Protein backbone atom coordinates (compact mmCIF):
# COMPACT_ATOMS: atom_id res chain seq x y z
CA UNK A 1 0.00 0.00 0.00
CA UNK A 2 3.08 2.18 -0.38
CA UNK A 3 2.26 4.67 -3.12
CA UNK A 4 5.08 7.10 -2.41
CA UNK A 5 7.01 8.34 -5.48
CA UNK A 6 10.23 6.44 -6.25
CA UNK A 7 13.46 8.02 -7.48
CA UNK A 8 15.99 5.76 -9.14
CA UNK A 9 19.65 6.25 -9.94
CA UNK A 10 21.47 3.84 -12.27
CA UNK A 11 25.03 3.78 -13.57
CA UNK A 12 26.26 1.24 -16.07
CA UNK A 13 29.88 0.82 -17.06
CA UNK A 14 29.90 -1.13 -20.30
CA UNK A 15 32.75 -2.89 -22.03
CA UNK A 16 32.06 -4.16 -25.54
CA UNK A 17 34.62 -6.57 -26.99
CA UNK A 18 35.02 -7.36 -30.69
CA UNK A 19 37.20 -10.25 -31.93
CA UNK A 20 38.87 -11.00 -28.61
CA UNK A 21 39.99 -7.64 -27.23
CA UNK A 22 41.15 -6.43 -30.65
CA UNK A 23 38.57 -3.66 -30.52
CA UNK A 24 37.07 -2.48 -27.24
CA UNK A 25 34.47 0.21 -26.62
CA UNK A 26 34.01 1.61 -23.11
CA UNK A 27 30.75 3.27 -22.16
CA UNK A 28 29.55 5.00 -19.00
CA UNK A 29 25.77 5.46 -18.99
CA UNK A 30 24.09 7.43 -16.20
CA UNK A 31 20.36 6.82 -15.97
CA UNK A 32 17.79 8.75 -13.94
CA UNK A 33 14.64 6.64 -13.38
CA UNK A 34 14.36 5.26 -16.91
CA UNK A 35 16.11 7.93 -18.98
CA UNK A 36 19.83 7.84 -19.76
CA UNK A 37 20.87 11.47 -19.19
CA UNK A 38 24.66 11.41 -19.45
CA UNK A 39 27.11 9.27 -21.40
CA UNK A 40 30.83 8.80 -21.92
CA UNK A 41 31.60 6.88 -25.09
CA UNK A 42 35.26 5.85 -25.43
CA UNK A 43 34.89 6.57 -29.16
CA UNK A 44 34.02 10.21 -28.44
CA UNK A 45 36.61 10.95 -25.78
CA UNK A 46 34.38 13.05 -23.54
CA UNK A 47 31.12 13.24 -21.63
CA UNK A 48 28.04 14.46 -23.43
CA UNK A 49 24.51 14.99 -22.16
CA UNK A 50 21.87 12.78 -23.77
CA UNK A 51 19.09 14.74 -22.04
CA UNK A 52 19.00 18.15 -20.36
CA UNK A 53 19.34 16.58 -16.92
CA UNK A 54 22.88 15.50 -17.71
CA UNK A 55 24.00 18.82 -19.19
CA UNK A 56 25.44 20.23 -15.94
CA UNK A 57 27.39 17.04 -15.31
CA UNK A 58 28.79 16.68 -18.83
CA UNK A 59 30.19 20.21 -18.66
CA UNK A 60 31.78 19.61 -15.27
CA UNK A 61 33.42 16.23 -15.87
CA UNK A 62 34.87 17.29 -19.20
CA UNK A 63 36.52 20.27 -17.51
CA UNK A 64 38.34 17.76 -15.30
CA UNK A 65 41.45 16.92 -17.33
CA UNK A 66 42.80 14.34 -14.86
CA UNK A 67 39.44 12.59 -14.53
CA UNK A 68 38.81 12.78 -18.26
CA UNK A 69 42.19 11.14 -18.91
CA UNK A 70 41.38 8.30 -16.52
CA UNK A 71 38.10 7.57 -18.33
CA UNK A 72 39.98 7.58 -21.62
CA UNK A 73 42.20 4.76 -20.34
CA UNK A 74 39.27 2.63 -19.14
CA UNK A 75 39.25 0.54 -22.33
CA UNK A 76 42.62 -0.77 -21.12
CA UNK A 77 42.75 -0.40 -17.33
CA UNK A 78 39.16 -1.53 -16.88
CA UNK A 79 37.80 -3.34 -19.92
CA UNK A 80 40.79 -5.42 -21.10
CA UNK A 81 41.84 -6.11 -17.51
CA UNK A 82 38.49 -7.57 -16.49
CA UNK A 83 38.16 -9.40 -19.80
CA UNK A 84 41.52 -10.99 -19.07
CA UNK A 85 40.42 -11.95 -15.56
CA UNK A 86 37.07 -13.41 -16.58
CA UNK A 87 37.80 -14.88 -20.02
CA UNK A 88 38.46 -18.41 -18.76
CA UNK A 89 34.98 -18.96 -17.28
CA UNK A 90 32.86 -16.61 -19.42
CA UNK A 91 34.19 -16.16 -22.94
CA UNK A 92 35.39 -19.79 -22.85
CA UNK A 93 32.38 -21.28 -21.06
CA UNK A 94 30.80 -24.20 -22.91
CA UNK A 95 28.11 -26.58 -21.75
CA UNK A 96 26.73 -29.28 -24.05
CA UNK A 97 22.91 -29.40 -24.57
CA UNK A 98 20.91 -32.34 -23.26
CA UNK A 99 18.50 -33.35 -26.03
CA UNK A 100 15.31 -35.33 -25.45
CA UNK A 101 12.33 -35.99 -27.72
CA UNK A 102 8.75 -36.72 -26.68
CA UNK A 103 5.11 -35.98 -27.64
CA UNK A 104 3.45 -32.99 -25.97
CA UNK A 105 1.60 -33.97 -22.79
CA UNK A 106 -1.36 -31.84 -23.91
CA UNK A 107 -2.95 -32.07 -27.36
CA UNK A 108 -5.59 -30.16 -29.31
CA UNK A 109 -6.52 -31.77 -32.64
CA UNK A 110 -6.49 -35.58 -32.30
CA UNK A 111 -5.09 -37.33 -35.38
CA UNK A 112 -2.03 -35.13 -35.60
CA UNK A 113 0.87 -35.59 -33.19
CA UNK A 114 2.83 -32.83 -31.49
CA UNK A 115 6.44 -33.90 -31.07
CA UNK A 116 8.65 -31.93 -28.71
CA UNK A 117 12.43 -31.64 -29.01
CA UNK A 118 13.78 -30.25 -25.74
CA UNK A 119 17.33 -28.87 -25.74
CA UNK A 120 18.35 -28.23 -22.13
CA UNK A 121 21.17 -26.71 -20.13
CA UNK A 122 23.39 -25.40 -22.91
CA UNK A 123 25.80 -22.46 -23.24
CA UNK A 124 26.51 -20.27 -25.16
CA UNK A 125 23.02 -19.36 -26.35
CA UNK A 126 23.92 -19.80 -30.03
CA UNK A 127 22.25 -23.01 -31.24
CA UNK A 128 20.54 -24.66 -34.24
CA UNK A 129 17.70 -27.15 -33.80
CA UNK A 130 16.20 -28.90 -36.82
CA UNK A 131 13.73 -31.73 -37.52
CA UNK A 132 14.17 -34.50 -40.09
CA UNK A 133 11.49 -36.86 -41.39
CA UNK A 134 13.91 -39.75 -42.16
CA UNK A 135 16.29 -37.48 -44.14
CA UNK A 136 14.17 -34.46 -45.05
CA UNK A 137 14.22 -31.40 -42.79
CA UNK A 138 10.58 -30.73 -41.92
CA UNK A 139 11.10 -26.97 -42.20
CA UNK A 140 7.30 -26.74 -42.01
CA UNK A 141 4.99 -27.27 -39.05
CA UNK A 142 7.79 -26.36 -36.65
CA UNK A 143 7.34 -23.93 -33.77
CA UNK A 144 9.99 -22.90 -31.26
CA UNK A 145 9.99 -21.14 -27.92
CA UNK A 146 13.13 -19.41 -29.08
CA UNK A 147 16.15 -19.00 -26.82
CA UNK A 148 15.26 -19.04 -23.12
CA UNK A 149 17.58 -18.02 -20.27
CA UNK A 150 17.44 -20.00 -17.04
CA UNK A 151 19.37 -17.31 -15.19
CA UNK A 152 22.14 -19.73 -14.18
CA UNK A 153 24.36 -19.52 -17.26
CA UNK A 154 22.41 -22.21 -19.09
CA UNK A 155 19.80 -21.87 -21.81
CA UNK A 156 16.96 -24.09 -22.98
CA UNK A 157 14.72 -24.16 -26.02
CA UNK A 158 11.88 -26.37 -27.18
CA UNK A 159 11.17 -26.96 -30.87
CA UNK A 160 7.76 -28.53 -31.49
CA UNK A 161 6.79 -30.36 -34.69
CA UNK A 162 3.20 -31.04 -35.75
CA UNK A 163 3.04 -34.50 -37.33
CA UNK A 164 0.81 -37.40 -38.33
CA UNK A 165 1.79 -40.84 -36.87
CA UNK A 166 2.48 -43.10 -39.85
CA UNK A 167 4.00 -46.58 -39.66
CA UNK A 168 7.60 -46.67 -40.85
CA UNK A 169 8.46 -43.04 -40.11
CA UNK A 170 11.57 -42.10 -38.12
CA UNK A 171 11.68 -38.44 -37.06
CA UNK A 172 15.04 -37.07 -35.93
CA UNK A 173 15.90 -33.91 -33.99
CA UNK A 174 19.31 -32.55 -35.00
CA UNK A 175 21.13 -30.06 -32.76
CA UNK A 176 24.21 -28.00 -33.58
CA UNK A 177 26.02 -26.19 -30.78
CA UNK A 178 29.58 -24.87 -30.38
CA UNK A 179 30.10 -27.36 -27.52
CA UNK A 180 30.05 -30.30 -29.93
CA UNK A 181 32.21 -31.08 -32.97
CA UNK A 182 29.38 -32.94 -34.70
CA UNK A 183 25.61 -32.39 -34.40
CA UNK A 184 23.64 -34.24 -31.73
CA UNK A 185 20.74 -36.32 -33.02
CA UNK A 186 17.77 -37.95 -31.35
CA UNK A 187 15.34 -40.24 -33.16
CA UNK A 188 11.75 -40.93 -32.22
CA UNK A 189 10.43 -44.48 -32.58
CA UNK A 190 6.92 -43.92 -33.98
CA UNK B 1 29.74 -7.50 -31.50
CA UNK B 2 31.02 -10.51 -29.60
CA UNK B 3 30.94 -10.05 -25.82
CA UNK B 4 29.76 -7.44 -23.33
CA UNK B 5 30.63 -6.99 -19.67
CA UNK B 6 28.57 -4.52 -17.66
CA UNK B 7 29.09 -3.13 -14.19
CA UNK B 8 25.51 -2.21 -13.28
CA UNK B 9 24.66 -0.45 -10.04
CA UNK B 10 21.66 1.43 -8.69
CA UNK B 11 20.30 3.21 -5.63
CA UNK B 12 16.58 3.60 -4.96
CA UNK B 13 14.80 6.24 -2.85
CA UNK B 14 12.92 6.25 -0.64
CA UNK B 15 13.45 2.49 -0.18
CA UNK B 16 17.17 3.14 0.25
CA UNK B 17 18.00 0.01 -1.72
CA UNK B 18 21.19 -0.31 -3.66
CA UNK B 19 22.70 -2.89 -5.91
CA UNK B 20 26.04 -3.58 -7.54
CA UNK B 21 26.51 -6.38 -10.05
CA UNK B 22 28.51 -7.45 -13.09
CA UNK B 23 26.78 -8.79 -16.18
CA UNK B 24 28.34 -10.90 -18.97
CA UNK B 25 26.19 -11.31 -22.09
CA UNK B 26 22.96 -11.21 -20.08
CA UNK B 27 24.17 -13.42 -17.19
CA UNK B 28 25.29 -12.31 -13.73
CA UNK B 29 28.95 -12.86 -12.87
CA UNK B 30 28.45 -11.62 -9.30
CA UNK B 31 26.84 -8.97 -7.09
CA UNK B 32 27.77 -7.50 -3.73
CA UNK B 33 25.66 -8.23 -0.66
CA UNK B 34 25.21 -4.73 0.76
CA UNK B 35 24.19 -6.17 4.12
CA UNK B 36 27.05 -8.66 4.57
CA UNK B 37 29.48 -6.42 2.66
CA UNK B 38 30.67 -9.39 0.61
CA UNK B 39 30.84 -10.39 -3.04
CA UNK B 40 28.50 -13.21 -4.08
CA UNK B 41 29.42 -15.20 -7.20
CA UNK B 42 26.52 -16.42 -9.34
CA UNK B 43 28.25 -19.78 -9.86
CA UNK B 44 30.56 -21.06 -7.13
CA UNK B 45 33.29 -21.83 -9.68
CA UNK B 46 33.61 -18.15 -10.53
CA UNK B 47 35.06 -17.25 -7.13
CA UNK B 48 37.74 -19.90 -7.67
CA UNK B 49 39.24 -17.91 -10.55
CA UNK B 50 38.45 -14.30 -9.72
CA UNK B 51 38.06 -11.96 -6.79
CA UNK B 52 36.35 -8.63 -6.21
CA UNK B 53 36.85 -6.24 -3.30
CA UNK B 54 33.28 -5.60 -2.16
CA UNK B 55 34.31 -2.40 -0.39
CA UNK B 56 34.66 -0.90 -3.86
CA UNK B 57 30.97 -1.54 -4.55
CA UNK B 58 29.83 -0.12 -1.23
CA UNK B 59 31.70 3.12 -1.93
CA UNK B 60 30.07 3.43 -5.36
CA UNK B 61 26.62 2.86 -3.91
CA UNK B 62 27.05 5.55 -1.23
CA UNK B 63 28.09 7.86 -4.05
CA UNK B 64 25.12 6.84 -6.20
CA UNK B 65 22.79 7.73 -3.32
CA UNK B 66 24.43 11.15 -2.94
CA UNK B 67 24.22 11.69 -6.70
CA UNK B 68 20.56 10.59 -6.81
CA UNK B 69 19.64 13.20 -4.21
CA UNK B 70 21.03 15.93 -6.46
CA UNK B 71 19.49 14.47 -9.63
CA UNK B 72 16.11 14.14 -7.93
CA UNK B 73 16.05 17.85 -7.08
CA UNK B 74 17.51 18.86 -10.43
CA UNK B 75 14.68 16.99 -12.18
CA UNK B 76 12.13 18.99 -10.19
CA UNK B 77 11.31 15.84 -8.24
CA UNK B 78 9.89 13.84 -11.14
CA UNK B 79 9.33 10.24 -9.92
CA UNK B 80 9.82 7.12 -11.97
CA UNK B 81 6.84 5.68 -13.88
CA UNK B 82 5.95 2.16 -12.70
CA UNK B 83 6.37 -0.41 -15.46
CA UNK B 84 4.62 -3.66 -14.40
CA UNK B 85 6.40 -7.02 -14.91
CA UNK B 86 5.81 -9.80 -17.39
CA UNK B 87 5.77 -13.11 -15.52
CA UNK B 88 6.46 -16.60 -16.84
CA UNK B 89 6.75 -19.90 -15.02
CA UNK B 90 8.78 -22.76 -16.45
CA UNK B 91 10.69 -25.86 -15.41
CA UNK B 92 14.48 -26.19 -15.58
CA UNK B 93 13.95 -29.32 -17.68
CA UNK B 94 11.24 -31.71 -18.94
CA UNK B 95 9.47 -33.09 -15.88
CA UNK B 96 9.15 -36.73 -14.92
CA UNK B 97 7.53 -37.98 -11.75
CA UNK B 98 9.97 -38.50 -8.85
CA UNK B 99 12.85 -36.92 -10.79
CA UNK B 100 14.09 -33.82 -8.87
CA UNK B 101 13.52 -30.59 -10.88
CA UNK B 102 13.31 -26.82 -10.47
CA UNK B 103 10.50 -24.34 -11.09
CA UNK B 104 11.61 -21.01 -12.53
CA UNK B 105 9.66 -17.78 -12.11
CA UNK B 106 10.94 -15.23 -14.58
CA UNK B 107 9.94 -11.62 -13.85
CA UNK B 108 10.72 -9.34 -16.79
CA UNK B 109 10.61 -5.78 -18.16
CA UNK B 110 9.73 -3.88 -14.98
CA UNK B 111 10.79 -0.88 -12.88
CA UNK B 112 11.40 0.29 -10.22
CA UNK B 113 13.50 -2.67 -8.93
CA UNK B 114 11.23 -3.65 -6.05
CA UNK B 115 9.10 -6.75 -6.32
CA UNK B 116 7.54 -9.28 -3.97
CA UNK B 117 7.63 -12.85 -5.25
CA UNK B 118 6.10 -15.84 -3.44
CA UNK B 119 5.85 -19.55 -4.31
CA UNK B 120 2.65 -21.45 -3.60
CA UNK B 121 2.15 -25.22 -3.43
CA UNK B 122 -1.52 -26.24 -3.53
CA UNK B 123 -2.40 -22.76 -2.28
CA UNK B 124 0.07 -22.56 0.60
CA UNK B 125 3.32 -20.54 0.57
CA UNK B 126 6.51 -22.59 0.40
CA UNK B 127 10.06 -21.40 1.06
CA UNK B 128 12.06 -24.58 1.56
CA UNK B 129 15.07 -24.58 -0.74
CA UNK B 130 13.96 -21.51 -2.70
CA UNK B 131 16.57 -19.11 -4.05
CA UNK B 132 16.56 -15.97 -6.21
CA UNK B 133 18.78 -13.64 -8.21
CA UNK B 134 19.16 -9.89 -7.69
CA UNK B 135 17.75 -7.43 -10.22
CA UNK B 136 19.41 -7.89 -13.60
CA UNK B 137 19.83 -4.97 -16.06
CA UNK B 138 18.02 -4.61 -19.39
CA UNK B 139 19.18 -2.44 -22.29
CA UNK B 140 15.99 -0.38 -21.95
CA UNK B 141 16.98 0.18 -18.30
CA UNK B 142 14.10 -1.88 -16.94
CA UNK B 143 14.91 -5.02 -14.95
CA UNK B 144 14.76 -8.83 -15.02
CA UNK B 145 14.78 -11.24 -12.05
CA UNK B 146 14.67 -15.02 -11.47
CA UNK B 147 13.12 -16.95 -8.60
CA UNK B 148 13.64 -20.71 -8.20
CA UNK B 149 11.82 -23.56 -6.50
CA UNK B 150 13.38 -27.03 -6.38
CA UNK B 151 10.71 -29.72 -6.28
CA UNK B 152 9.79 -33.37 -6.64
CA UNK B 153 7.19 -33.69 -9.47
CA UNK B 154 3.76 -34.88 -8.29
CA UNK B 155 0.54 -35.29 -10.31
CA UNK B 156 -1.33 -33.98 -7.28
CA UNK B 157 0.53 -30.71 -6.81
CA UNK B 158 -0.30 -27.32 -8.31
CA UNK B 159 2.21 -24.49 -7.99
CA UNK B 160 1.85 -20.72 -8.32
CA UNK B 161 4.40 -17.95 -8.64
CA UNK B 162 2.78 -14.87 -7.05
CA UNK B 163 4.16 -11.49 -8.09
CA UNK B 164 3.53 -8.07 -6.55
CA UNK B 165 4.63 -4.76 -8.10
CA UNK B 166 3.43 -1.18 -7.76
CA UNK B 167 2.74 -1.11 -11.48
CA UNK B 168 0.16 -3.90 -11.17
CA UNK B 169 -3.54 -3.30 -10.49
CA UNK B 170 -3.55 -6.62 -8.62
CA UNK B 171 -0.94 -9.17 -7.51
CA UNK B 172 -0.30 -11.66 -10.32
CA UNK B 173 -0.43 -15.47 -10.26
CA UNK B 174 1.25 -17.77 -12.81
CA UNK B 175 0.15 -21.41 -12.57
CA UNK B 176 2.12 -24.62 -13.22
CA UNK B 177 1.23 -28.25 -12.51
CA UNK B 178 2.36 -31.65 -13.70
CA UNK B 179 0.77 -32.07 -17.08
Amino acid sequence: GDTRPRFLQQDKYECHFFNGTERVRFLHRDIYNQEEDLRFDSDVGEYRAVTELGRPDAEYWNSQKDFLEDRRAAVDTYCRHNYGVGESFTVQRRVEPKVTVYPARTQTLQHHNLLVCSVNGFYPGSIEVRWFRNSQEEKAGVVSTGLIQNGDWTFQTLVMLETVPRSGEVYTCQVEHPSVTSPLTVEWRA
Amino acid sequence: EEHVIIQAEFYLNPDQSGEFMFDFDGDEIFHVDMAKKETVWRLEEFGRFASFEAQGALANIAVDKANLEIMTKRSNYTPITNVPPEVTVLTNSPVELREPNVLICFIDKFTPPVVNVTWLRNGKPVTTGVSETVFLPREDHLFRKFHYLPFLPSTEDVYDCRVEHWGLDEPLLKHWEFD
Binding site: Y13, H81, V85 | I29, A50, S51, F52, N67
Partner: peptide, 20 residues
Protein backbone atom coordinates in the same frame (compact mmCIF):
# COMPACT_ATOMS: atom_id res chain seq x y z
CA UNK C 1 52.74 -15.49 -3.47
CA UNK C 2 49.80 -17.49 -4.94
CA UNK C 3 48.56 -14.38 -6.80
CA UNK C 4 44.92 -13.25 -6.86
CA UNK C 5 43.09 -11.88 -9.90
CA UNK C 6 40.60 -9.11 -9.12
CA UNK C 7 37.84 -7.74 -11.30
CA UNK C 8 38.20 -3.94 -11.23
CA UNK C 9 35.26 -1.60 -10.78
CA UNK C 10 35.00 1.89 -12.23
CA UNK C 11 34.91 4.35 -9.32
CA UNK C 12 31.95 6.69 -9.53
CA UNK C 13 32.77 10.24 -8.38
CA UNK C 14 30.49 12.51 -6.39
CA UNK C 15 28.40 14.99 -8.38
CA UNK C 16 29.28 18.56 -7.33
CA UNK C 17 26.63 20.63 -5.54
CA UNK C 18 24.65 23.01 -7.83
CA UNK C 19 25.90 25.94 -5.72
CA UNK C 20 23.68 28.67 -4.26
Amino acid sequence: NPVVHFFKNIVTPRTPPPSQ
